[PDB]
Amino acid sequence: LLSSAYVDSHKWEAREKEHYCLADLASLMDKTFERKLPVSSLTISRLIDNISSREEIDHAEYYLYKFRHSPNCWYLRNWTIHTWIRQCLKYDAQDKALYTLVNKVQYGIFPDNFTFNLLMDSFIKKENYKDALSVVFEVMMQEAFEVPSTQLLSLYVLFHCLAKKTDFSWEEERNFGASLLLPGLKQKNSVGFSSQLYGYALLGKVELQQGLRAVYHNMPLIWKPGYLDRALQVMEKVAASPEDIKLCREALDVLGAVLKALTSKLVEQLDIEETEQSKLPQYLERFKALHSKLQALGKIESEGLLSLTTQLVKEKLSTCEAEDIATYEQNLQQWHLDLVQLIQREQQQREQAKQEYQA
Amino acid sequence: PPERELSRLRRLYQGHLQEESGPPPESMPK
Amino acid sequence: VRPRLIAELARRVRALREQLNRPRDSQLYAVDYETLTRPFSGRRLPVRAWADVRRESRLLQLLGRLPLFGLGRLVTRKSWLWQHDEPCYWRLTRVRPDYTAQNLDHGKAWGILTFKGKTESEAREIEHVMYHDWRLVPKHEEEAFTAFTPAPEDSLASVPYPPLLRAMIIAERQKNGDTSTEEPMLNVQRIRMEPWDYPAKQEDKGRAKGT
Amino acid sequence: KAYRGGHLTIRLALGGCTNRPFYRIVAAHNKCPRDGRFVEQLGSYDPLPNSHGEKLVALNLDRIRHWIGCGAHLSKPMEKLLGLAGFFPLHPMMITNAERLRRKRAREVLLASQK
Incomplete structure (x- = not known):
């Protein structure tokens, strides 16, 4: 879905690179780890920069693991992560990039939005929507929906996957609900509000059937009950919204199906508060009333979610890509400056050590 | 105590509660 | 005094071994x-x-x-x-x-x-x-x-003295010629009762020793 | 003698004989034995009623105030005794135990009425 200019690798190929043999840097890091001493971020940056084969990706994965479990794990630089993902894409190793992204705790791979988009678009271009969905879920887990391009791409992938899904595990429901709620909240259009309602419906089904802890545990979600009430609040907000804002019929149908299926361990809530299972009937009544209201005002969209998202993408992704490319240009320049500063510090320290030793 | 605080204590001590005590007798029972 | 040097050696060795075998x-x-x-x-x-x-x-x-x-x-x-x-x-x-x-x-x-x-x-x-x-x-x-x-965090600004202490204060005032009718009062504005669950200073906390 | 840490506390040291207790209010290091070395004797307490039906408590209020101002702590029975004297507010546990006794006796009276 992204243009050739966005995914072009020429300018990262053109970065100033100081060449080393990966074996030498690997041996130096091995000796440093044997001595129980900290390895510099510059060393791992050089190691990742000098991947020249698919087997060197296997070696660099191990050394990324080792650096993550070292005293200077915090100092892994952003350009190193970007270069790792670039190398993985270059040498047909998207599986390794996805493995390191999924196990980000063990490898410290926390990409920026541009790198998420690169990986997601590679998977989309190769029609591997399962791995694209995995990347979208990883974006959700890191709460990296701060850039419009990532939001649009994730919404497209999520709706494409949902259009062909019937059997839902509650873990899958939770993941889909979070991954559609987070980008939907940042888009003030019909697609965004429909995504909000759909995700709230899914999360509310999970809350009612499996409990609220199943919803908020290890997720970027709040620990307050009332997700179905929040869906109904989205409906009410759309009722008082400007004309252009509408709601897809599919999202409303999903919410209705959830409510119709719901109306047919430690206690976390205060006993004085009314439980959601006791509020299901009034939720159903409110849903019916608000559905009739929205139908009356003509605030219901008949186009499917996937088609609407496709149209919105074709309308906005070009400008989003332009902005992202400019930010990427700026980031590359700043990364070059920082790397040169690190190299200078390392060289100054070595020469000073030499003037110490000559005495 | 307010009802909300009593409910908070009941949640805090789930399964390890006694019967709630009301106001004590104003005078010492004879 | 006959010096106890083995004690010096033992304390230094134990300090080094505790600093190097930190759990x-x-x-x-x-x-x-x-x-x-x-x-x-x-x-x-x-x-x-x-x-x-x-x-x-x-x-x-x-x-x-x-x-x-x-x-x-x-x-x-x-x-x-x-x-x-x-x-x-x-x-x-x-x-x-x-x-x-x-x-x-x-x-x-x-x-x-x-x-x-x-x-x-x-x-x-x-x-x-x-x-x-x-x-x-x-x-x-x-x-x-x-x-x-x-x-608005408006709490009591002062409280009465305990009975006997109040009586003693009043008696002292009357003995010293003071005839004021103002009640003795304890200022509690400088006593802030901090909730027991407030975070303490972790810098002052100890650590489990390796054994 | 040097104790590792510790602090001064005003407490009751038990003397007397078997079945006849008597207490000496003393300010002492918390690590010292109950009836051992003390810094100063600050009073006394006879828990057995005398021929007049009285429990006699002697409190050196000046020295008690001095040692409290010098950083001395207080044992709980001393807090209760000082609350009884009116030197301190009544300790919360005296009030709570009074209420508990009131409820227990109310239950007993209700049992008698039910019978």
Whole structure:
């Protein structure tokens, strides 16, 4: 879905690179780890920069693991992560990039939005929507929906996957609900509000059937009950919204199906508060009333979610890509400056050590 | 105590509660 | 006095061996969830914590899944959420992960504390980092989570003296010629009763010794 | 003698004989034995009623105030005794125990009425 200019690798190929043999840097890091001493971020940056084969990706994965479990794990630089993902894409190793992204705790791979988009678009271009969905879920887990391009791409992938899904595990429901709620909240259009309602419906089904802890545990979600009430609040907000804002019929149908299926361990809530299972009937009544209201005002969209998202993408992704490319240009320049500063510090320290030793 | 605080204590001590005590007798029972 | 040099040697050697064989957080604060005992010492945890130990997450179990170990993010605690209605949280400023942990789920943290809606001026070390009591505030919820309107905190400014002490004060005044009819009064404006669950100074806290 | 840490506390040292207790209010190091070395004797307490049906308590209020101002702690029975004297507020546990006794006797009276 992204243009050739966005995914072009020429300018990262053109970065100033100081060449080393990966074996030498690997041996130096091995000796440093044997001595129980900290390895510099510059060393791992050089190691990742000098991947020249698919087997060197296997070696660099191990050394990324080792650096993550070292005293200077915090100092892994952003350009190193970007270069790792670039190398993985270059040498047909998207599986390794996805493995390191999924196990980000063990490898410290926390990409920026541009790198998420690169990986997601590679998977989309190769029609591997399962791995694209995995990347979208990883974006959700890191709460990296701060850039419009990532939001649009994730919404497209999520709706494409949902259009062909019937059997839902509650873990899958939770993941889909979070991954559609987070980008939907940042888009003030019909697609965004429909995504909000759909995700709230899914999360509310999970809350009612499996409990609220199943919803908020290890997720970027709040620990307050009332997700179905929040869906109904989205409906009410759309009722008082400007004309252009509408709601897809599919999202409303999903919410209705959830409510119709719901109306047919430690206690976390205060006993004085009314439980959601006791509020299901009034939720159903409110849903019916608000559905009739929205139908009356003509605030219901008949186009499917996937088609609407496709149209919105074709309308906005070009400008989003332009902005992202400019930010990427700026980031590359700043990364070059920082790397040169690190190299200078390392060289100054070595020469000073030499003037110490000559005495 | 307010009802909300009593409910908070009941949640805090789930399964390890006694019967709630009301106001004590104003005078010492004879 | 006949010098005791073996004592000097023993103390120095023990100090060196304790400084070089330091047990790490991953070893000290590991827990066997089936028996809820510490493998390092074998001591079982108190009963009232058991459920939490099996349900909630340690702070760095959350931070190790975030970029930069979650610097600048807001982290709250389950116990604070249950006990207090006003917002309580830490704004992280510095994190020192325990690299020896497989999942990087042990370590130390520093931040700015806000307790019951009152923010502190400086950043200090966070206590109970290893407790299974921690929750991460979502970014899209922070604005709603941090919202707080400071209610009027008007408490008693003074209290009566105890009976006998009041009588003694009045008797002393009358003996010294003073005939004032004003009641003796104890000022309690300078006594701020801090809630027992407020974070203490982790910098002053000790550490389990290696055995 | 040097104790590791510790602090001064005003407490009751038990003397007398078997089945006849008597207490000396003393300010002493918390680590010292109950009836051992003390810094100063600050009073006395006879828990057995005398021929007049009275429990006699002697309190050196000046020295008690001095040692409290010097950083001395207080044992719980001393807090209760000083609350009874009116020198301190009544300790919360005296009030709570009084209420508990009131409820227990109310239950007993209700049992009698039910019978």
